Design a protein around this ligand. Structure first.
Ligand SMILES: *[C@@H]1O[C@H](CO)[C@@H](O[C@@H]2O[C@H](CO)[C@@H](O[C@@H]3O[C@H](CO[C@H]4O[C@H](CO)[C@@H](O)[C@H](O)[C@@H]4O)[C@@H](O)[C@H](O[C@H]4O[C@H](CO)[C@@H](O)[C@H](O)[C@@H]4O)[C@@H]3O)[C@H](O)[C@H]2NC(C)=O)[C@H](O)[C@H]1NC(C)=O
Ligand SMILES: *[C@@H]1O[C@H](CO)[C@@H](O[C@@H]2O[C@H](CO)[C@@H](O[C@@H]3O[C@H](CO[C@H]4O[C@H](CO)[C@@H](O)[C@H](O)[C@@H]4O)[C@@H](O)[C@H](O[C@H]4O[C@H](CO)[C@@H](O)[C@H](O)[C@@H]4O)[C@@H]3O)[C@H](O)[C@H]2NC(C)=O)[C@H](O)[C@H]1NC(C)=O
Ligand SMILES: *[C@@H]1O[C@H](CO)[C@@H](O[C@@H]2O[C@H](CO)[C@@H](O[C@@H]3O[C@H](CO[C@H]4O[C@H](CO)[C@@H](O)[C@H](O)[C@@H]4O)[C@@H](O)[C@H](O[C@H]4O[C@H](CO)[C@@H](O)[C@H](O)[C@@H]4O)[C@@H]3O)[C@H](O)[C@H]2NC(C)=O)[C@H](O)[C@H]1NC(C)=O
Ligand SMILES: CC(=O)N[C@H]1[C@H]([C@H](O)[C@H](O)CO)O[C@@](OC[C@H]2O[C@@H](O)[C@H](O)[C@@H](O)[C@H]2O)(C(=O)O)C[C@@H]1O
Ligand SMILES: CC(=O)N[C@H]1[C@H]([C@H](O)[C@H](O)CO)O[C@@](OC[C@H]2O[C@@H](O)[C@H](O)[C@@H](O)[C@H]2O)(C(=O)O)C[C@@H]1O
Ligand SMILES: CC(=O)N[C@H]1[C@H]([C@H](O)[C@H](O)CO)O[C@@](OC[C@H]2O[C@@H](O)[C@H](O)[C@@H](O)[C@H]2O)(C(=O)O)C[C@@H]1O
Ligand SMILES: *[C@@H]1O[C@H](CO)[C@@H](O[C@@H]2O[C@H](CO)[C@@H](O)[C@H](O)[C@H]2NC(C)=O)[C@H](O)[C@H]1NC(C)=O
Ligand SMILES: *[C@@H]1O[C@H](CO)[C@@H](O[C@@H]2O[C@H](CO)[C@@H](O)[C@H](O)[C@H]2NC(C)=O)[C@H](O)[C@H]1NC(C)=O
Ligand SMILES: *[C@@H]1O[C@H](CO)[C@@H](O[C@@H]2O[C@H](CO)[C@@H](O)[C@H](O)[C@H]2NC(C)=O)[C@H](O)[C@H]1NC(C)=O
Ligand SMILES: *[C@@H]1O[C@H](CO)[C@@H](O)[C@H](O)[C@H]1NC(C)=O
Ligand SMILES: *[C@@H]1O[C@H](CO)[C@@H](O)[C@H](O)[C@H]1NC(C)=O
Ligand SMILES: *[C@@H]1O[C@H](CO)[C@@H](O)[C@H](O)[C@H]1NC(C)=O
Lengths: 485, 486, 485
């Protein structure tokens, strides 16, 4: 007689994963699906990263004297450091966030000088709070107009848009601290600024009052913006307290954005940028930060998610035995194989078809459901330094909802994939056993432990024929029937 | 002896679907789950669709002379064309989108005239920029008040809400271009308009300055609105630059909305409306547009999603009968599973109705168990913009993108899971039929290894029919079968 | 000979669930996953709940005389009743919702009095619309300044923030009804109020005009707020129509919120609070309300969702029979068992291993994918008493999208879990049958009804050995072979 057994490989060190029906189960191999670390650096390729050392985007746009190196710059991502500061005339911007977001999304600081004509007033006003070297200065992109002689005539100028692109204009209004200062600068006792197009209008009345000292000034300047479509026209009408523009900014559409971070910039290649630094995007999920730019993994709350890439791990108990509650640590060539006890001796081989089928099924399984990468460039703000109320609450609620939903999706997907992997491996083993049983019609009996008891003389050639699939039962039919009964 | 085989049908041309464990597998039949085309026309039933033609909703509400045909109109969906224009006094509306959404959601333009008394001022002002035929005119729902004689007395009027429904009032403020114009129209050198109720107030100070010429006017008019609850009182106080209302609009709660489109309107029936036109809602997902009205399929990014309907398609081997082991039967058209028998009388074929019916019943109605039939949404947020604004527009775009991504992922996962379960159930049905057939023959037959049984006794057509029916009795063949086997 | 059967238990009354491949299937046991009822009361533990009674949060903060009991109060959840009313000077708050949300999220009403100096004006103004007992009064936290003698000097005061926490200041502007009233109260014909810090500024110009009578007054007061960071300074500049503050509120960060409800408050323990009342949080989903505070189940549209707990329910048909299309209602000591017919007599036993395995797999099944509870404290508003436009539409859209997505998730999860439960129970039964068949090598053959017939004499000891797994086929092989052939 002879003995033939079927079994599967095993490893000394397994990994614990989670499935639908099992809290913990050990498998031969697994991979991590969550990226939870960063190098702390921001790669300068392939995106064009612009580093604002001590300047905010708004200050660079306005023309702060210590931000003059940023003139006519372009970027894919603008990085704002926490050590940035303002060193010019004090100012405030109503709807600061909207202007900052639109400027960042434009992605360029291209400025074109236009020939504005201001008759009856003095131009190029300066202050000691904004020093350009040893002399008083001002924002390079703004014009401060004051009285000439002893009069401030009413200003009424126009400028049409004859190009094929939109124009962005930045202008301002001056708020004096005292009535005497207001009358000294502008002869009128109450100024007025009106800027309008064929479809929109804005009018600001300056406010007079004391304010906390900032770099020796108790006055302030408010900043406003206007966009002129092609074929439209811009009209500026003012009675005083006007901070005139010097030109327009060319506004574009693209995939530029802005980020707050303190990480240094190095020479490397990475497609994902986070405030903590660049991270690889070879995993579907990440746990570093919910603020991202480029092709990045989705953010989830979990810090680890193991995906099974192997079969169940079962130790070998201490006469050969099959796969019934028994693994084989001696199999190196494949995942499934045959162990036979013969008159010549004990042998062992491996089956390539079932192993290849299992490997092909397992490989690239996660790519069938989830997308490879998602590219997001400009999004909403997710961190705030001041309390505002309704809009901030809405933004926080939206972000929280998105994070929770994606975390649930990731958990469910991992559990389902692990369960299906275990099921497919078990099914492959059972299919191999059933095929082996079908090959031997009545010359063998099931020993009950994953092994077959062949009742005729089966040499090495016979075992090889069984493994190949060319076993002929009619040859040994009579001998096996005689031996069994 | 005799031979009995079990197998399943196959088709000459199959469809390729995607499962959890397989990226490309061929099945006998599949159906498309994504609607990706439209007729290009908007059906006028069962929803009431109002064509705006060359008028916007705000212009129609205000009373533009060329929009006078829209007085006291009702709609379920208001369609705005891209060729609409304004032909009256130039104006601007602070928070234009909010007022547009409010009017669209109200769903009606019902106007009730009220008896307002304005003492000491002239009424029914007109301009050459708003012509009512050959003569000067103005907005039909607004009253322009100017000085009478040489004085403009302070106006102080009241109007109580004695009804049981809310009132919507539309009023305005005039912005002169020059100080001389302001003094000429109204005696005071600085106007002031105050409209308030018991719980809210609004005050506007007009601005004087030149503006680009629009239809011969360098002045502008601002538009404001106020809502008066039942039992409340409206008080209007002004001393210049007031564009008085003539009445109130009835405001209702319903399922009306507004849509921007250029598609023509035709006579047909459709429950879903998109800017591209109407689309059928028989499929759970669509790819036409993310802007929808009515009972519409959910929007996804995928162009196509095939749901498996039949079994795995296996070609017939060209080579003695064979079973279902890696071989399909091309000659079966009366069922999904059947028997092929080789006998002394001759060969034959049949079909098993029970297993086929069970598989069909399991497959039928499969997607309705998870996905709800259809979702009905009427008024939503705006999803396309023509100007850059900043924070709010970014938030709206982010919300829409998040929703679209989540629904696309859900659709992909659902399709993969359903295909996998369909394949598994079909294979299980085939295996169960084979196991039952084996269980019927206790010791008179043995498995041949290729999905066929070798019966070791003379089994005529009646015996085969008894096997197929399930009334086979092995006792009266047992002796002969055991004698033949050994 | 002897007969051995394998089967599973059944119950007289079952329940219907839904699976992936079945519209309706009856199981032996199921549990409800959706909470759809409440006791109508709000439990006062463990959260600190403050009853607003007939006062609103804004009125309590301002210092309404009938809300004086709320001074220096703390809360985790503030409950606003629909019967609340105002009984002081008429007022309006621009961006009322933002201030309400800010105060609610702060979670305290701690007030610190500061020594402001107002030179040349009279303080502690009062009105008949706000009665402090028999005499005229005003808001306790606000100071009404009017002319002294026949002059109203320009006011210019400062207050620095030398602490290490943020300060919140509440101030106001008075709107007279007539020019004569404006002149009588304040000498100047046009007032002006300017409040600013080193980084922000606000200027309000009062408006004069008649307004509807409210408690005998045709005038109004507009409320504004300002926040001063540590190291900053507050400057107040005005020349009329100023409602001065008396101090600052301590603003904190925490998990406090506000709710609108009419349910009474009783003494009990509950972690979840809804406007309908408190609900238990032992279920993953709830259908009571979409407004929640604390550890609450997720809100879904469905009102019922049944999760399978037992196996399929098959009534027993009317010579023992196995599990093939037949259940056993007489078995109560286990889920799976054996029935044998013997010469000595019939019997019945239960198998504990398979039952324990099935119970362990079923137990804690839902905890493998979904979390126990999610804690949410402060969120967006979800019900509105008036129409506003864009922001309200955005909030409603966000809430609707979240609800729809979570409902879909719940439905799919329930269907998948039910399908897997049915599959695992069937697999357990089939595995037990296969093991029993494997034990009997050649001494028995399946008769097709889930039972085995044994061709040798098998007494109670032999049946017990078969159940235990110690059955030896070699002892009876010869007798069984002789009987079979
Ligand atoms: C309405 O009320 C506000 C607030 O009370 C007033 O604003 C103050 O205005 C005064 C000037 O009028 C300001 O005083 C100035 O402060 C400067 C900054 O002080 C800081 O830095 C110095 C030096 O580093 C420190 O010693 C000091 O502690 C602060 O940390 C000083 O640099 C100025 O000095 C100048 O004047 C002195 C006068 O002796 C000279 O000796 C100096 O050389 C130099 O020329 C000056 O002291 C004060 O800071 C303002 N306060 C605020 C909060 O802004 C308004 O003036 C008031 N309006 C009216 C109309 O009354
Ligand atoms: C502050 O600054 C603004 C901007 O510069 C000034 O606004 C301009 O005002 C003038 C009038 O004061 C406007 O000129 C008028 O333009 C009308 C439209 O012009 C278009 O159409 C004509 C014909 O189709 C074209 O030829 C032309 O190129 C334009 O395409 C004209 O129809 C008007 O014609 C009137 O005057 C002529 C003079 O000969 C008469 O013959 C006519 O019958 C008719 O009465 C007129 O020419 C100009 O368009 C305004 N510009 C803008 C941008 O709005 C403010 O006036 C200024 N304010 C102060 C106080 O100085
Ligand atoms: C601009 O226009 C507005 C609106 O028309 C005017 O506002 C009105 O002003 C008058 C004058 O004060 C107000 O009249 C007062 O109404 C009080 C409330 O009335 C209600 O309550 C009483 C008692 O419950 C009811 O009987 C009554 O029907 C109302 O339901 C009264 O209590 C006042 O009575 C006082 O005056 C009378 C005069 O004889 C005395 O006998 C009384 O004892 C008491 O002293 C008074 O009648 C009216 O309510 C205001 N209406 C609104 C809507 O606000 C502005 O005055 C006007 N501005 C200018 C400059 O003209
Ligand atoms: C455009 C212009 O007029 N620039 C002035 C500037 C303005 O007058 C002022 O800053 C507007 O608020 O003032 C400069 O001087 C400041 C200086 O002025 C004296 O009159 C005053 O006595 C000093 O205390 C001090 O404020 C400035 O450098 O800011 C001069 C500049 O030309
Ligand atoms: C209600 C009223 O007064 N309507 C007037 C209107 C207004 O005076 C004006 O539009 C307010 O801005 O003006 C109308 O004439 C415009 C006409 O006025 C002359 O005085 C001027 O010299 C011309 O150039 C021209 O602007 C108009 O039709 O708009 C007359 C109308 O009665
Ligand atoms: C701070 C102050 O001046 N309080 C007054 C208050 C104000 O004058 C008024 O409310 C501002 O609008 O008015 C009080 O009197 C109300 C009373 O005043 C008479 O002059 C008038 O003729 C009456 O009709 C009536 O309005 C008030 O109690 O509100 C007095 C208070 O001292
Ligand atoms: C990436 O940077 C963020 C900074 O926003 C880190 O998040 C903070 O971590 C600290 C320390 O645990 C917490 O006190 C803060 O509350 C966190 N902030 C937020 C907004 O969550 C994050 O830990 C960093 N991650 C890595 C991997 O470095
Ligand atoms: C339905 O109409 C929309 C119009 O918004 C079409 O979307 C545009 O398609 C063109 C052509 O590919 C693109 O260039 C635009 O960028 C698309 N716009 C947006 C907002 O996506 C859409 O293709 C139409 N669909 C059908 C089936 O006709
Ligand atoms: C819990 O309270 C809410 C209050 O909003 C109830 O919801 C309302 O129920 C009534 C009665 O059917 C409806 O007419 C309203 O339209 C509902 N409002 C909303 C916003 O849905 C809810 O039914 C209560 N639930 C329980 C279990 O008491
Ligand atoms: C485990 O799987 C990973 C990825 O599938 C593979 O790179 C690795 O070699 C595997 N480990 C072993 C021991 O085969
Ligand atoms: C394929 O399925 C669809 C619907 O499921 C059905 O209408 C069609 O007839 C099927 N195809 C065949 C060849 O039966
Ligand atoms: C049904 O299941 C629940 C929870 O698993 C359990 O409490 C209950 O006792 C079960 N019913 C029966 C009859 O065992």
């Amino acid at each position: 007689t002879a003995t033939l057994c079927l079994g599967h490989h095993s490893v000394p060190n397994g990994t614990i994963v989670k499935t639908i029906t099992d809290d913990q189960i050990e498998v031969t191999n697994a991979t991590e699906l969550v990226q939870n670390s960063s190098t702390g650096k921001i790669c300068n390729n392939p995106h064009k990263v612009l580093d604002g050392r001590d300047c905010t985007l708004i200050d660079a746009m306005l023309g702060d004297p210590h931000c003059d190196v940023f003139q006519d710059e372009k970027w894919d991502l603008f990085v704002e450091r926490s050590s940035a500061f303002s060193n010019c005339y004090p100012y405030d911007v109503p709807d600061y966030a909207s202007l900052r977001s639109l400027i960042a999304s434009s992605g360029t600081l291209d400025f074109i000088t236009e020939s504005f004509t201001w008759a009856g007033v003095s131009q190029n006003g300066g202050s000691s709070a904004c020093k350009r070297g040893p002399a008083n200065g001002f924002f390079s992109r703004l014009n401060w107009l004051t009285k000439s002689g002893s009069s401030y005539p009413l200003l009424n100028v126009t400028m049409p848009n004859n190009y094929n692109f939109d124009k962005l204009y930045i202008w301002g209004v001056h708020h004096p601290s005292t009535n005497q200062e207001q009358t000294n600068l502008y002869v009128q006792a109450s100024g007025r600024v009106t800027v309008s197009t064929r479809r929109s209008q804005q009018t600001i009345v300056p406010n007079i009052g004391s304010r906390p000292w900032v770099r020796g000034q108790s006055s302030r300047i408010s900043i406003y913006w206007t966009i002129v479509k092609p074929g439209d026209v811009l009209v500026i009408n003012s009675n005083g307290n006007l901070i005139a523009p010097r030109g327009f900014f060319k506004i574009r559409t693209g995939r530029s954005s802005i980020m707050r971070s303190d990480a240094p910039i190095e020479t490397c290649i990475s497609e994902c940028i986070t405030p903590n630094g660049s991270i690889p995007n070879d995993k579907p999920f990440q746990n570093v930060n919910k603020i991202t730019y480029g092709a990045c993994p989705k953010y989830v709350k979990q810090n680890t998610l193991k995906l099974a890439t192997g079969m169940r791990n079962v130790p070998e108990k201490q006469a050969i035995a099959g796969f019934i509650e028994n693994g084989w640590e001696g199999m190196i060539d494949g995942w499934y194989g045959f162990r036979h006890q013969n008159s010549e001796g004990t042998g062992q081989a491996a089956d390539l078809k079932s192993t290849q089928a299992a490997i092909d099924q397992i490989n690239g399984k996660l790519n069938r459901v989830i997308e490879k990468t998602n590219e997001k460039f400009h999004q909403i703000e997710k961190e705030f330094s001041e309390v505002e109320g309704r809009i901030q609450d809405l933004e926080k609620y939206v972000e929280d909802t998105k994070v929770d939903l994606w975390s649930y999706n990731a958990e469910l997907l991992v559990a389902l994939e692990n369960q299906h992997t275990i099921d497919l491996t078990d099914s492959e083993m059972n299919k191999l056993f059933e095929k082996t049983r079908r090959q031997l019609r009545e010359n063998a009996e099931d020993m009950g432990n994953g092994c077959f008891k062949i009742y005729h003389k089966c040499d090495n050639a016979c075992i090889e024929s069984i493994r190949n699939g060319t076993y002929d039962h009619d040859i040994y039919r009579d001998e096996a029937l005689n031996n069994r009964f």
